[PDB]
Short mmCIF file of all heavy atoms in Angstrom, two decimals:
data_model
loop_
_atom_site.label_atom_id
_atom_site.label_comp_id
_atom_site.label_asym_id
_atom_site.label_seq_id
_atom_site.Cartn_x
_atom_site.Cartn_y
_atom_site.Cartn_z
N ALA A 11 291.69 -3.75 253.91
CA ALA A 11 291.05 -3.88 252.61
C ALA A 11 290.48 -5.29 252.53
O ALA A 11 290.87 -6.16 253.28
CB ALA A 11 292.04 -3.55 251.49
N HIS A 12 289.54 -5.48 251.59
CA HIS A 12 288.99 -6.77 251.21
C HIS A 12 288.62 -7.65 252.41
O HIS A 12 288.97 -8.82 252.49
CB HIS A 12 289.96 -7.52 250.33
CG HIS A 12 290.54 -6.69 249.20
ND1 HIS A 12 290.06 -6.70 247.90
CD2 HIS A 12 291.77 -6.08 249.23
CE1 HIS A 12 291.02 -6.14 247.14
NE2 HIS A 12 292.05 -5.77 247.93
N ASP A 13 287.93 -7.05 253.40
CA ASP A 13 287.39 -7.74 254.56
C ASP A 13 288.50 -8.48 255.35
O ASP A 13 288.21 -9.50 255.99
CB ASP A 13 286.27 -8.71 254.14
CG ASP A 13 285.46 -8.26 252.95
OD1 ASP A 13 284.96 -7.11 252.95
OD2 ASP A 13 285.32 -9.12 252.04
N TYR A 14 289.75 -8.01 255.26
CA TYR A 14 290.86 -8.73 255.87
C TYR A 14 290.69 -8.78 257.39
O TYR A 14 290.25 -7.81 258.00
CB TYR A 14 292.19 -8.07 255.47
CG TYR A 14 293.40 -8.49 256.30
CD1 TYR A 14 294.22 -9.56 255.90
CD2 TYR A 14 293.66 -7.82 257.51
CE1 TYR A 14 295.31 -9.94 256.68
CE2 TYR A 14 294.79 -8.19 258.29
CZ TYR A 14 295.60 -9.25 257.86
OH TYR A 14 296.75 -9.57 258.57
N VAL A 15 291.09 -9.91 257.98
CA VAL A 15 291.14 -10.10 259.42
C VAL A 15 292.55 -10.61 259.77
O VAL A 15 293.16 -11.34 258.99
CB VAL A 15 290.06 -11.08 259.88
CG1 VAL A 15 288.67 -10.47 259.65
CG2 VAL A 15 290.13 -12.43 259.12
N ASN A 16 293.06 -10.21 260.93
CA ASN A 16 294.33 -10.65 261.44
C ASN A 16 294.32 -12.07 261.92
O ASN A 16 295.37 -12.73 261.93
CB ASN A 16 294.87 -9.69 262.53
CG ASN A 16 295.66 -8.56 261.89
OD1 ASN A 16 296.60 -8.80 261.14
ND2 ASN A 16 295.29 -7.32 262.14
N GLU A 17 293.16 -12.58 262.36
CA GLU A 17 292.92 -13.97 262.65
C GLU A 17 291.89 -14.50 261.67
O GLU A 17 290.76 -14.03 261.67
CB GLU A 17 292.37 -14.09 264.08
CG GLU A 17 292.40 -15.53 264.56
CD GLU A 17 291.99 -15.68 266.02
OE1 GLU A 17 292.33 -14.77 266.80
OE2 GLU A 17 291.37 -16.73 266.31
N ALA A 18 292.29 -15.44 260.84
CA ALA A 18 291.42 -16.13 259.88
C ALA A 18 290.06 -16.45 260.53
O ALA A 18 289.02 -16.11 259.94
CB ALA A 18 292.11 -17.40 259.36
N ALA A 19 290.10 -17.03 261.70
CA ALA A 19 288.90 -17.41 262.46
C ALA A 19 287.90 -16.27 262.58
O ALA A 19 286.70 -16.52 262.49
CB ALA A 19 289.29 -17.96 263.84
N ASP A 20 288.35 -15.02 262.77
CA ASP A 20 287.43 -13.88 262.83
C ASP A 20 286.43 -13.90 261.67
O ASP A 20 285.24 -13.67 261.82
CB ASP A 20 288.18 -12.56 262.82
CG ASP A 20 287.25 -11.41 263.19
OD1 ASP A 20 287.03 -11.21 264.39
OD2 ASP A 20 286.73 -10.77 262.24
N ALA A 21 286.93 -14.26 260.47
CA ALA A 21 286.16 -14.25 259.25
C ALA A 21 285.12 -15.36 259.19
O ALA A 21 284.47 -15.51 258.15
CB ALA A 21 287.07 -14.27 258.03
N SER A 22 284.88 -16.13 260.26
CA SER A 22 283.78 -17.09 260.33
C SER A 22 282.42 -16.52 259.91
O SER A 22 281.57 -17.22 259.36
CB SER A 22 283.71 -17.67 261.75
OG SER A 22 284.86 -18.48 261.98
N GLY A 23 282.25 -15.23 260.16
CA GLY A 23 281.06 -14.46 259.81
C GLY A 23 280.93 -14.21 258.30
O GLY A 23 279.84 -13.96 257.81
N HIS A 24 282.06 -14.23 257.58
CA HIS A 24 282.15 -13.85 256.18
C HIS A 24 281.66 -14.99 255.27
O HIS A 24 282.29 -16.04 255.26
CB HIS A 24 283.61 -13.54 255.86
CG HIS A 24 283.79 -12.82 254.56
ND1 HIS A 24 283.75 -13.41 253.33
CD2 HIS A 24 284.06 -11.49 254.38
CE1 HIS A 24 283.97 -12.45 252.39
NE2 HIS A 24 284.18 -11.28 253.03
N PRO A 25 280.60 -14.81 254.45
CA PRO A 25 280.13 -15.84 253.53
C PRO A 25 281.25 -16.54 252.73
O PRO A 25 281.30 -17.74 252.67
CB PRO A 25 279.11 -15.13 252.61
CG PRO A 25 278.55 -14.05 253.53
CD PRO A 25 279.77 -13.63 254.37
N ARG A 26 282.14 -15.73 252.11
CA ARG A 26 283.24 -16.30 251.31
C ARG A 26 284.24 -17.12 252.15
O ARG A 26 285.05 -17.79 251.54
CB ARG A 26 283.98 -15.18 250.54
CG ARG A 26 284.81 -15.63 249.34
CD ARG A 26 286.33 -15.56 249.63
NE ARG A 26 287.20 -16.31 248.72
CZ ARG A 26 287.53 -17.60 248.85
NH1 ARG A 26 286.87 -18.39 249.71
NH2 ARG A 26 288.53 -18.12 248.13
N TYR A 27 284.26 -17.02 253.48
CA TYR A 27 285.20 -17.75 254.29
C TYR A 27 284.89 -19.26 254.37
O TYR A 27 283.71 -19.66 254.36
CB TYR A 27 285.34 -17.14 255.69
CG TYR A 27 286.32 -17.81 256.62
CD1 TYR A 27 287.69 -17.54 256.49
CD2 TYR A 27 285.90 -18.66 257.65
CE1 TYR A 27 288.62 -18.08 257.38
CE2 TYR A 27 286.80 -19.17 258.59
CZ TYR A 27 288.18 -18.85 258.47
OH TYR A 27 289.09 -19.30 259.38
N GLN A 28 285.92 -20.07 254.40
CA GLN A 28 285.94 -21.47 254.77
C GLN A 28 287.12 -21.60 255.73
O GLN A 28 288.07 -20.83 255.59
CB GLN A 28 286.26 -22.35 253.54
CG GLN A 28 285.24 -22.32 252.42
CD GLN A 28 285.29 -21.04 251.61
OE1 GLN A 28 286.35 -20.60 251.16
NE2 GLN A 28 284.15 -20.36 251.47
N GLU A 29 287.03 -22.54 256.65
CA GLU A 29 288.08 -22.77 257.66
C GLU A 29 289.36 -23.29 256.99
O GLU A 29 289.36 -23.69 255.83
CB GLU A 29 287.58 -23.75 258.74
CG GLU A 29 287.24 -23.00 260.04
CD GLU A 29 288.43 -22.19 260.54
OE1 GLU A 29 289.58 -22.65 260.25
OE2 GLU A 29 288.20 -21.08 261.08
N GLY A 30 290.44 -23.23 257.77
CA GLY A 30 291.75 -23.70 257.38
C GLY A 30 292.51 -22.69 256.51
O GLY A 30 293.73 -22.68 256.46
N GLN A 31 291.75 -21.86 255.78
CA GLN A 31 292.33 -20.85 254.91
C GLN A 31 293.00 -19.77 255.76
O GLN A 31 292.33 -19.01 256.43
CB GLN A 31 291.22 -20.26 254.03
CG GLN A 31 290.66 -21.27 253.01
CD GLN A 31 289.52 -20.68 252.19
OE1 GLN A 31 289.49 -20.76 250.98
NE2 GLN A 31 288.55 -20.11 252.89
N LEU A 32 294.34 -19.70 255.69
CA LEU A 32 295.15 -18.69 256.32
C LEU A 32 295.98 -18.00 255.23
O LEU A 32 296.34 -18.69 254.26
CB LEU A 32 296.12 -19.35 257.32
CG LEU A 32 295.69 -19.40 258.79
CD1 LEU A 32 294.47 -20.26 259.09
CD2 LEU A 32 296.85 -19.98 259.61
N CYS A 33 296.31 -16.72 255.36
CA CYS A 33 297.22 -16.02 254.48
C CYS A 33 298.43 -16.88 254.11
O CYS A 33 298.79 -17.01 252.95
CB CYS A 33 297.67 -14.71 255.11
SG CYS A 33 296.52 -13.33 254.83
N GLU A 34 299.08 -17.52 255.09
CA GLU A 34 300.25 -18.35 254.81
C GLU A 34 300.00 -19.46 253.75
O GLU A 34 300.95 -19.86 253.08
CB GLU A 34 300.84 -18.89 256.09
CG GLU A 34 300.08 -20.04 256.75
CD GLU A 34 300.78 -20.58 257.99
OE1 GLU A 34 301.62 -19.85 258.54
OE2 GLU A 34 300.47 -21.74 258.34
N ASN A 35 298.77 -19.93 253.62
CA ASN A 35 298.35 -20.94 252.63
C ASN A 35 297.48 -20.34 251.54
O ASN A 35 296.72 -21.05 250.87
CB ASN A 35 297.68 -22.14 253.33
CG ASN A 35 296.34 -21.84 253.99
OD1 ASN A 35 295.43 -21.26 253.40
ND2 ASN A 35 296.19 -22.30 255.20
N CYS A 36 297.59 -19.03 251.30
CA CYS A 36 296.94 -18.31 250.22
C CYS A 36 297.82 -18.39 248.97
O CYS A 36 299.03 -18.25 249.05
CB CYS A 36 296.75 -16.89 250.68
SG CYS A 36 295.85 -15.86 249.54
N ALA A 37 297.22 -18.60 247.80
CA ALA A 37 297.95 -18.62 246.54
C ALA A 37 298.68 -17.31 246.27
O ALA A 37 299.67 -17.29 245.56
CB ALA A 37 297.03 -18.99 245.40
N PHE A 38 298.17 -16.21 246.83
CA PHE A 38 298.82 -14.91 246.71
C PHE A 38 299.79 -14.64 247.85
O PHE A 38 300.30 -13.53 247.94
CB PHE A 38 297.77 -13.79 246.61
CG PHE A 38 296.80 -13.95 245.45
CD1 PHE A 38 295.40 -14.04 245.70
CD2 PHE A 38 297.28 -14.11 244.14
CE1 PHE A 38 294.52 -14.29 244.63
CE2 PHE A 38 296.40 -14.39 243.08
CZ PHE A 38 295.02 -14.49 243.33
N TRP A 39 300.09 -15.61 248.72
CA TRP A 39 301.10 -15.41 249.74
C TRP A 39 302.43 -15.03 249.08
O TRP A 39 302.80 -15.59 248.06
CB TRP A 39 301.27 -16.71 250.54
CG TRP A 39 302.26 -16.61 251.69
CD1 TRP A 39 303.39 -17.34 251.81
CD2 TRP A 39 302.17 -15.80 252.89
NE1 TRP A 39 303.99 -17.04 253.01
CE2 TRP A 39 303.27 -16.11 253.74
CE3 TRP A 39 301.23 -14.84 253.40
CZ2 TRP A 39 303.46 -15.53 254.99
CZ3 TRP A 39 301.41 -14.27 254.65
CH2 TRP A 39 302.52 -14.61 255.47
N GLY A 40 303.15 -14.07 249.68
CA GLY A 40 304.50 -13.74 249.26
C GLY A 40 305.46 -14.65 249.98
O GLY A 40 305.87 -15.69 249.45
N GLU A 41 305.85 -14.28 251.20
CA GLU A 41 306.75 -15.03 252.06
C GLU A 41 306.60 -14.46 253.47
O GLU A 41 306.12 -13.32 253.61
CB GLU A 41 308.20 -14.92 251.55
CG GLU A 41 309.13 -15.94 252.21
CD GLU A 41 310.52 -15.93 251.54
OE1 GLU A 41 310.92 -14.85 251.09
OE2 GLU A 41 311.14 -17.03 251.53
N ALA A 42 306.97 -15.26 254.47
CA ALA A 42 306.97 -14.81 255.85
C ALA A 42 308.18 -13.90 256.08
O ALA A 42 309.29 -14.18 255.60
CB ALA A 42 306.97 -15.98 256.81
N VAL A 43 307.96 -12.80 256.78
CA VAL A 43 308.91 -11.73 256.97
C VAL A 43 309.42 -11.79 258.41
O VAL A 43 310.63 -11.73 258.64
CB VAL A 43 308.23 -10.39 256.67
CG1 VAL A 43 309.16 -9.19 256.90
CG2 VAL A 43 307.73 -10.35 255.20
N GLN A 44 308.50 -11.89 259.39
CA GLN A 44 308.85 -11.91 260.79
C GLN A 44 307.84 -12.71 261.64
O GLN A 44 307.41 -13.78 261.20
CB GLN A 44 309.11 -10.48 261.25
CG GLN A 44 307.95 -9.52 261.01
CD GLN A 44 308.34 -8.13 261.51
OE1 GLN A 44 308.56 -7.21 260.73
NE2 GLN A 44 308.44 -7.96 262.83
N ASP A 45 307.46 -12.21 262.81
CA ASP A 45 306.79 -12.90 263.91
C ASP A 45 305.35 -13.29 263.59
O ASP A 45 304.39 -12.81 264.18
CB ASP A 45 306.90 -12.05 265.19
CG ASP A 45 306.50 -10.61 264.98
OD1 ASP A 45 307.17 -9.90 264.22
OD2 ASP A 45 305.50 -10.15 265.60
N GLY A 46 305.20 -14.21 262.64
CA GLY A 46 303.92 -14.64 262.13
C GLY A 46 303.29 -13.55 261.26
O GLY A 46 302.09 -13.43 261.21
N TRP A 47 304.12 -12.78 260.54
CA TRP A 47 303.71 -11.80 259.56
C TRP A 47 304.55 -12.00 258.32
O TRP A 47 305.72 -12.32 258.40
CB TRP A 47 303.98 -10.39 260.11
CG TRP A 47 303.24 -10.04 261.36
CD1 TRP A 47 303.66 -10.25 262.63
CD2 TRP A 47 301.93 -9.44 261.46
NE1 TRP A 47 302.67 -9.87 263.49
CE2 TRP A 47 301.57 -9.37 262.84
CE3 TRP A 47 301.03 -8.89 260.54
CZ2 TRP A 47 300.34 -8.84 263.27
CZ3 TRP A 47 299.77 -8.42 260.95
CH2 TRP A 47 299.39 -8.46 262.30
N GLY A 48 303.90 -11.80 257.15
CA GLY A 48 304.53 -11.93 255.86
C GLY A 48 303.85 -11.05 254.81
O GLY A 48 302.89 -10.34 255.10
N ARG A 49 304.39 -11.08 253.61
CA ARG A 49 303.89 -10.31 252.50
C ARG A 49 302.79 -11.07 251.72
O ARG A 49 302.74 -12.30 251.78
CB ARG A 49 305.09 -10.02 251.60
CG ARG A 49 306.17 -9.35 252.41
CD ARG A 49 307.07 -8.57 251.48
NE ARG A 49 306.45 -7.27 251.14
CZ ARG A 49 306.63 -6.13 251.82
NH1 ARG A 49 307.33 -6.13 252.96
NH2 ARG A 49 306.13 -4.98 251.41
N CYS A 50 301.99 -10.32 250.96
CA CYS A 50 300.90 -10.82 250.15
C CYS A 50 301.00 -10.12 248.78
O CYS A 50 300.99 -8.91 248.69
CB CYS A 50 299.59 -10.55 250.85
SG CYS A 50 298.22 -10.72 249.73
N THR A 51 301.13 -10.92 247.71
CA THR A 51 301.38 -10.46 246.36
C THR A 51 300.10 -9.88 245.73
O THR A 51 299.52 -10.42 244.81
CB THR A 51 301.99 -11.58 245.51
OG1 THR A 51 301.19 -12.73 245.48
CG2 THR A 51 303.38 -11.96 246.04
N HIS A 52 299.67 -8.73 246.27
CA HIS A 52 298.65 -7.86 245.69
C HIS A 52 299.06 -6.44 246.06
O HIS A 52 299.39 -6.22 247.22
CB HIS A 52 297.28 -8.21 246.26
CG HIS A 52 296.44 -9.12 245.40
ND1 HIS A 52 296.83 -10.35 244.92
CD2 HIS A 52 295.16 -8.87 244.99
CE1 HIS A 52 295.80 -10.84 244.21
NE2 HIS A 52 294.77 -9.96 244.25
N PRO A 53 299.08 -5.49 245.13
CA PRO A 53 299.48 -4.11 245.42
C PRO A 53 298.53 -3.54 246.48
O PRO A 53 298.98 -2.98 247.50
CB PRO A 53 299.42 -3.35 244.11
CG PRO A 53 298.44 -4.17 243.25
CD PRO A 53 298.67 -5.60 243.74
#
């Protein structure tokens, strides 16, 4: 959903993207769950 990419860098093509922005540093980040995967506070 919402143009999501597993590697932030993939989204270099996306107008709304800026570098450095990773899910882990997203204001809607939940918490890290496991092996570089975590939750995101949006249903």
Side-chain angles (χ1 to χ4, degrees):
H12 313 262
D13 328 308
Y14 166 93
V15 294
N16 272 305
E17 192 174 325
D20 192 83
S22 292
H24 194 282
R26 200 253 163 272
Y27 180 80
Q28 296 74 51
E29 256 303 331
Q31 292 177 131
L32 264 66
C33 274
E34 76 177 20
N35 67 49
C36 185
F38 303 122
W39 183 243
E41 193 172 32
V43 177
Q44 57 180 108
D45 50 295
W47 299 89
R49 304 203 81 90
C50 165
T51 57
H52 262 54

